[PDB]
Amino acid sequence: STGSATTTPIDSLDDAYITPVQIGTPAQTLNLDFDTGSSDLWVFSSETTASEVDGQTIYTPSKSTTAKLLSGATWSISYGDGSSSSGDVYTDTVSVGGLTVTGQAVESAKKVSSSFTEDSTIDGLLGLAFSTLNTVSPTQQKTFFDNAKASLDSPVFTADLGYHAPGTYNFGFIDTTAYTGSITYTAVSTKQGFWEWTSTGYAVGSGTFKSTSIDGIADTGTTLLYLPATVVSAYWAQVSGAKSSSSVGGYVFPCSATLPSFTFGVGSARIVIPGDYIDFGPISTGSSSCFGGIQSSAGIGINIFGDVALKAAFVVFNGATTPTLGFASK
């Protein structure tokens, strides 16, 4: 089997991407944030504290003839940005772009933190990291990909995120028309439950490539590119007037600037992030100070190849017995 679904930016900055997901019978379509950095499929629901729902579409398990309460199961998750959610668990039928999993754990939120409430466009998350990170207790549950894997034509999914435009998540096949050149594959460590890999270096603009190992995660659920302070300083030094602002919480730059590209290495191959991808616009409405899309990972504890990086590539998440990651230009 295979599936194919369009993923759409939630706003003009590509702050996140939503993908429609069918849950239950009859189908209830919710727009979920596909997140290769976590492993829980959770939704706003009829059980979510009413004051914490503000415009989201909810899953109502009582209206699904295939929903079953997973007795005794609870979940609770905290994300790197300080947001959180928690609740109980149903199993139900879940379909993504024509690919159907029966008995998928659908984690129903009883509580969500303010950032989730305040974002009316995201109805929940669909985790695509390794199932070892799943938070369901006392019986850990499998991700959608993990459940689908054996049925897929090939045990893979691909992320093809757009810049200020829709893109595609495919399951079970590689669309050879969606990228240019070849896909370069690179080793993955699953030891921390992430799609963790090691970039071979970077370049800033038309500058020379610096060969250096950068361990990080391919994370579709993180907006920006978070790299070591040395690398980030080298990038922003090429932008006149750019500075790290403690009050804002990262590097800012004059909105009048033209940003240089940023290249990262995948083995001997190179992925080029155009300068415009690194612009996250005014820090506040009307400001001429703009927020940078490349930021320091110092104090995160891990480097994160988030959407800014991933949207410059066609990315293969290869879930073979020994997982690997593939990157192609597009």
XYZ file of C-alpha atoms in Angstrom:
330
model
C 0.000 0.000 0.000
C 0.909 3.675 -0.232
C -0.439 7.034 0.843
C 0.039 10.593 -0.385
C -1.204 13.759 1.298
C -0.671 17.447 0.722
C 0.828 19.464 3.559
C 0.071 23.187 3.781
C 1.776 26.034 5.668
C -0.400 27.390 8.489
C 0.586 31.007 7.830
C 2.615 33.268 5.566
C 5.868 32.475 7.417
C 5.690 28.665 7.181
C 5.598 28.499 10.989
C 4.311 24.932 10.692
C 2.562 22.649 8.214
C -0.792 20.887 8.494
C -1.880 17.714 6.753
C -5.456 16.409 6.700
C -5.983 13.108 8.541
C -9.150 10.985 8.579
C -10.010 9.552 12.008
C -12.879 7.234 12.834
C -16.022 5.964 11.145
C -17.549 7.953 9.542
C -14.356 9.884 8.958
C -13.607 12.949 11.045
C -10.985 15.000 9.214
C -8.526 16.873 11.413
C -5.537 18.924 10.286
C -2.492 17.582 12.065
C 1.112 18.753 12.404
C 3.264 15.863 11.163
C 6.224 15.819 13.526
C 9.313 13.691 12.868
C 10.613 14.869 16.266
C 7.941 13.176 18.393
C 5.962 9.958 18.509
C 2.449 10.670 19.765
C -0.642 11.096 17.598
C -2.826 13.386 19.690
C -5.884 15.452 18.881
C -8.132 18.152 20.178
C -11.302 16.341 21.149
C -14.717 16.428 22.758
C -12.821 15.717 26.009
C -10.572 18.788 25.788
C -11.206 21.389 28.490
C -13.677 23.753 26.816
C -11.806 26.958 27.685
C -8.703 25.487 26.006
C -10.403 25.019 22.639
C -10.446 28.097 20.370
C -11.368 27.295 16.776
C -9.779 23.855 16.384
C -11.654 20.969 14.850
C -12.228 18.269 17.474
C -12.347 14.486 17.369
C -15.474 13.101 19.031
C -14.860 9.411 19.701
C -18.475 8.771 20.729
C -19.477 9.545 17.124
C -17.053 6.973 15.710
C -18.331 3.398 15.455
C -14.758 2.095 15.338
C -13.431 4.018 18.376
C -12.554 1.997 21.447
C -11.313 3.364 24.741
C -7.864 1.982 25.514
C -8.649 1.119 29.098
C -6.372 2.662 31.689
C -4.109 4.395 29.167
C -3.027 7.986 29.647
C -0.502 10.237 27.955
C 1.356 13.433 28.718
C 3.919 15.217 26.572
C 6.092 18.305 26.811
C 7.766 19.733 23.712
C 11.040 21.586 23.214
C 9.249 24.917 22.906
C 7.724 24.509 26.362
C 4.244 23.576 25.161
C 2.409 20.497 26.457
C -0.723 18.369 26.309
C -2.156 15.291 28.034
C -5.192 13.035 28.161
C -6.508 9.525 27.562
C -6.397 7.143 24.610
C -8.654 5.547 22.045
C -7.860 3.149 19.265
C -9.507 3.948 15.949
C -9.096 3.842 12.188
C -6.712 6.495 10.872
C -6.100 7.285 7.213
C -3.542 9.592 5.624
C -3.760 10.281 1.924
C -5.430 6.950 1.189
C -3.292 4.821 3.534
C -5.337 3.263 6.337
C -4.252 1.919 9.725
C -6.808 0.152 11.908
C -6.298 0.096 15.670
C -4.145 3.232 15.727
C -3.708 4.841 19.137
C -5.415 8.235 18.960
C -4.504 10.218 22.042
C -7.385 12.439 23.087
C -6.387 15.685 24.785
C -8.046 16.578 28.061
C -5.596 19.461 28.571
C -3.475 21.527 26.190
C -1.154 24.436 26.937
C -1.838 27.987 25.813
C 0.243 27.909 22.622
C -1.922 25.074 21.292
C -5.169 26.816 22.229
C -3.932 30.017 20.599
C -3.223 28.282 17.291
C -6.598 27.607 15.695
C -5.054 25.976 12.619
C -3.497 22.930 14.309
C -5.953 20.237 15.464
C -3.219 17.990 16.914
C 0.081 16.261 16.148
C 0.992 13.112 14.256
C 4.346 11.871 15.489
C 6.777 10.260 13.078
C 9.852 9.753 15.269
C 10.568 6.295 16.705
C 7.906 4.626 18.829
C 10.316 4.379 21.770
C 9.477 8.064 22.476
C 5.706 7.478 22.620
C 4.339 8.705 25.964
C 1.338 6.406 26.468
C 1.342 4.692 29.845
C 1.284 1.952 31.032
C 1.486 0.405 27.559
C 3.544 2.367 25.031
C 1.876 2.738 21.638
C 3.196 2.662 18.067
C 3.289 5.575 15.631
C 1.161 5.657 12.500
C 4.231 4.885 10.374
C 5.270 2.002 12.634
C 1.782 0.485 12.361
C 1.626 0.984 8.581
C 5.185 -0.127 7.833
C 4.683 -3.799 7.105
C 1.826 -3.051 4.695
C 3.734 -0.392 2.745
C 5.251 -1.156 -0.652
C 8.554 0.094 0.809
C 9.079 0.901 4.510
C 9.625 4.627 3.971
C 7.957 7.995 4.142
C 9.067 11.195 2.465
C 8.780 14.867 3.380
C 8.646 17.440 0.613
C 7.857 20.712 2.364
C 7.194 23.843 0.349
C 8.549 27.351 0.798
C 5.505 29.565 1.154
C 3.587 26.845 -0.716
C 2.029 23.405 -0.240
C 4.087 20.239 -0.299
C 3.662 16.511 0.143
C 4.058 13.652 2.612
C 4.219 10.259 0.874
C 4.146 6.866 2.560
C 5.497 3.691 1.049
C 7.132 5.016 -2.123
C 9.691 7.474 -3.430
C 8.332 9.865 -6.057
C 11.238 10.050 -8.486
C 9.716 13.107 -10.179
C 9.802 15.174 -6.972
C 13.544 15.856 -6.799
C 16.537 16.669 -8.999
C 19.760 14.663 -9.198
C 20.268 11.776 -6.785
C 19.203 11.076 -3.227
C 22.180 10.882 -0.861
C 21.619 8.557 2.057
C 23.262 8.966 5.427
C 23.402 6.956 8.678
C 20.806 7.356 11.440
C 21.150 6.759 15.162
C 17.889 5.825 16.854
C 19.473 5.900 20.336
C 17.556 9.019 21.419
C 14.417 8.030 19.497
C 14.963 10.654 16.773
C 15.959 10.667 13.114
C 19.446 11.648 14.233
C 22.225 12.020 11.685
C 25.529 13.814 11.132
C 25.909 16.579 8.585
C 29.338 16.855 6.999
C 29.584 20.648 7.207
C 28.311 23.974 5.959
C 28.877 27.054 3.858
C 27.569 30.610 4.139
C 26.542 32.229 0.876
C 29.186 31.810 -1.814
C 31.771 31.048 0.873
C 34.006 28.011 1.115
C 32.599 24.823 2.567
C 33.717 24.041 6.117
C 34.071 20.317 6.697
C 32.884 19.584 10.210
C 30.584 16.988 11.746
C 27.261 18.359 12.995
C 25.078 15.816 14.778
C 21.405 16.748 14.677
C 17.837 15.608 14.107
C 15.572 15.850 11.087
C 12.541 17.435 12.700
C 9.542 18.493 10.640
C 7.831 19.734 13.821
C 10.418 22.437 14.487
C 10.171 25.619 12.414
C 13.766 26.818 12.409
C 17.300 25.534 11.881
C 19.159 25.273 15.214
C 22.925 24.815 14.939
C 26.036 25.311 17.087
C 26.779 28.879 18.148
C 29.990 28.963 16.091
C 28.136 28.105 12.869
C 25.295 30.517 13.578
C 27.687 33.375 14.392
C 29.504 32.741 11.115
C 26.220 32.983 9.219
C 24.897 36.188 10.815
C 28.294 37.891 10.574
C 27.578 38.087 6.829
C 24.425 40.160 7.404
C 25.052 43.832 8.129
C 23.348 44.897 11.344
C 22.435 41.385 12.479
C 22.772 40.708 16.186
C 21.760 38.276 18.869
C 19.023 39.844 20.985
C 18.457 38.384 24.447
C 15.212 40.352 24.747
C 13.819 38.907 21.533
C 15.358 35.461 22.112
C 17.683 35.043 19.161
C 19.321 36.578 16.147
C 17.499 39.459 14.512
C 18.449 41.429 11.428
C 17.385 44.566 9.568
C 14.343 43.786 7.470
C 16.039 45.744 4.646
C 18.801 43.108 4.392
C 19.301 40.589 1.626
C 20.098 37.284 3.360
C 22.829 34.939 2.105
C 22.086 31.288 1.453
C 23.193 28.543 3.835
C 24.505 25.201 2.586
C 24.643 22.016 4.638
C 26.444 18.790 3.800
C 24.917 15.347 3.442
C 27.863 13.081 2.837
C 29.593 14.497 -0.233
C 26.338 16.148 -1.340
C 25.164 19.691 -0.585
C 21.726 21.147 0.173
C 21.364 24.897 -0.409
C 18.889 26.863 1.703
C 18.112 30.101 -0.157
C 18.457 33.288 1.857
C 14.737 34.067 1.670
C 13.965 30.825 3.570
C 15.834 32.277 6.566
C 13.576 35.362 6.869
C 10.878 35.045 9.540
C 9.685 38.606 9.256
C 9.149 41.461 11.693
C 9.587 40.573 15.363
C 6.341 42.447 16.048
C 3.852 43.997 13.657
C 5.340 47.081 12.010
C 8.875 46.501 13.243
C 11.865 46.852 10.931
C 13.737 44.221 12.940
C 13.235 40.747 11.449
C 13.684 37.337 13.089
C 16.298 34.944 11.781
C 15.556 31.415 10.644
C 18.942 30.083 11.732
C 19.413 30.181 15.503
C 21.793 28.784 18.105
C 21.135 25.346 19.570
C 23.230 26.199 22.626
C 21.116 25.295 25.633
C 18.778 23.043 23.609
C 21.207 20.168 23.952
C 20.792 19.030 20.359
C 21.042 20.506 16.864
C 17.766 20.581 14.952
C 17.368 20.465 11.195
C 13.874 21.902 11.248
C 11.611 23.113 8.464
C 13.983 25.873 7.296
C 16.487 23.159 6.347
C 14.127 20.360 5.382
C 12.006 22.452 2.999
C 15.108 23.008 0.848
C 15.210 19.239 0.199
C 13.274 16.136 -0.688
C 13.790 14.013 2.424
C 13.490 10.239 2.703
C 12.800 8.751 6.118
C 13.859 5.158 5.495
C 12.415 2.864 8.148
C 14.171 -0.293 7.008
C 15.571 -2.615 9.683
C 18.543 -0.258 9.866
C 16.975 3.175 9.347
C 18.659 5.831 7.196
C 17.877 9.344 5.947
C 18.042 10.496 2.339
C 18.324 14.063 1.017
C 17.986 15.324 -2.538
C 17.842 18.811 -3.999
C 14.574 19.752 -5.695
